[PDB]
Design a protein around this ligand. Structure first.
Ligand code: JVO
Ligand code: JVO
Lengths: 203, 203
């Protein structure tokens, strides 16, 4: 009845904040997970009949969807503590373009400017687990959401490279792509107001 | 000796923070202002011999320049308090694409995805003063930096539309594009460390 896409980069804390708020107003609610790389490809399918996508991916205008900002999350670029680039010097960070990147693939094969790989040496996976497996074994480096990485960092098994590029981790906006229909529906503006307010309570 | 570009979107508070820090290490320092729309076009000119650009504009890789994040600033979309879109409803914000936008022009005529206009009805100017003139007279709407707008907002002469798109104003990263040469130069890493640290003191 109300279909909702949540990409894999959205912390599960955000996913309970949304579900909780939506259930106040809506009777039937469906929650679908996607790779960030497949999130916008999915809502562009009319048959998929998504009503709301919460995703990190951005495009300037999709046909029947408006865009707004729900909040902010932090990606880090990570590699094996004894990776070529372990020192994390600006030179190291410049060289990311030359060392093998572990990137999320996409059904369509295409990628947004925001999400495509920065490296020529690229090896695709389907999710951030497949990614962080290949990375603890040093096959490459990858960008992954904070919540996927916090453990393996204090567990010494992974190291951050991003800090000299963007201290505190790479800020990424969480977009809300909503069917135009839902503008001027108190139920949705209520979802938006609450979801946001409760993620300023998180942040 | 050290040429530094600062685009017009960089608050003048950031511009004193940078200059102060740079003077500790460097003897001869030149500060050049540019439209955000002309900032990257300028450093791509080899003859221009820029060593550092501080700008809101982003491209994935310029030839002899690396990129990093200095901090964050806030744009707002603004119009005449009695503009068609005064209510600032999601429908209003969706309609930005149809009402006349006052945008900054560029020498090259071309624009980055990040900075190009969202509207078909578009009227170019050269700076945010020319912009906010045309906007208080309701010829259109425009996105302008916080520091350009704070006065005319509490002076009732301008109204915000952005809030339902991005509460608190549209977060935009401030990029630092530095000549590859300056990586592994304590003087630059000192500038970076201090400039950043003193803009977390601002923020
Ligand atoms: C939104 C973005 C941050 N992102 C990506 N991938 C986009 C791109 O391939 C990332 O490449 C970069 C590599 C290095 C640097 C600078 C440094 N250090 C910048 C970009 N994958 C993501 C997964 C999760 C999240 Cl939250 C954001 C991701
Ligand atoms: C970096 C960006 C925010 N920006 C721009 N122009 C880019 C683009 O033309 C802005 O259009 C938008 C219009 C509406 C919305 C959603 C709402 N409400 C989003 C984008 N010009 C800028 C001037 C100063 C600064 Cl700091 C950022 C600017």
């Amino acid at each position: 009845n109300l279909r909702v896409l949540l990409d894999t980069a959205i912390p599960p804390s955000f996913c309970d904040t949304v579900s909780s708020v939506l259930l106040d107003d809506f009777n039937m609610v469906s929650l679908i997970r996607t790779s960030p790389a497949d999130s916008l490809a999915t809502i562009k399918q009319d048959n998929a009949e998504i009503d709301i996508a919460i995703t990190i991916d951005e495009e300037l205008k999709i046909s029947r969807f408006n865009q707004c900002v729900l909040g902010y999350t932090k990606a880090f670029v990570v590699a094996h503590p004894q990776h070529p680039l372990c020192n994390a010097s600006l030179h190291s960070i410049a060289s990311l373009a030359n060392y093998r990147q572990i990137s999320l693939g996409s059904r369509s094969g295409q990628h947004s400017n925001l999400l495509r790989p920065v490296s020529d040496k690229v090896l695709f996976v389907e999710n951030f687990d497949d990614m962080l497996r290949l990375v603890e074994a040093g096959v490459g480096w990858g960008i992954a959401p904070h919540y996927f990485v916090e453990e393996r960092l204090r567990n010494g098994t992974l190291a951050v490279l991003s800090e000299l590029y963007e201290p505190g981790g790479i800020d990424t906006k969480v977009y809300c792509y909503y069917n135009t229909a839902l503008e001027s529906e108190r139920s949705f503006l209520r979802f938006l107001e609450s979801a946001r307010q409760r993620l300023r309570e998180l942040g």
